[PDB]
Design a protein that fits this description.
It has no helix or strand. The protein is low in regular secondary structure. The protein is elongated and about 35 Å long. The protein binds one RNA strand through loops.
Amino acid sequence: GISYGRKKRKHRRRAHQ
RNA sequence: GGGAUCUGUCACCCCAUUGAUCGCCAGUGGCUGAUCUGGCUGGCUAGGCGGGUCCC
């Protein structure tokens, strides 16, 4: 089953160890 | 050479587009391409590399 639709939201907030 | 702490950089996941902004072509239309905020009191007792300091 295919699915179309994304939240299109950022996934990077840490940007650090 | 190892371990611990700190910093920088890089790669992802979840919730809120049903919230917000930009560009192009035509009147209703079409297009992820890019950007924004909040939760790090969600995950480093998930990963890699460099530098400084301490200890051996």
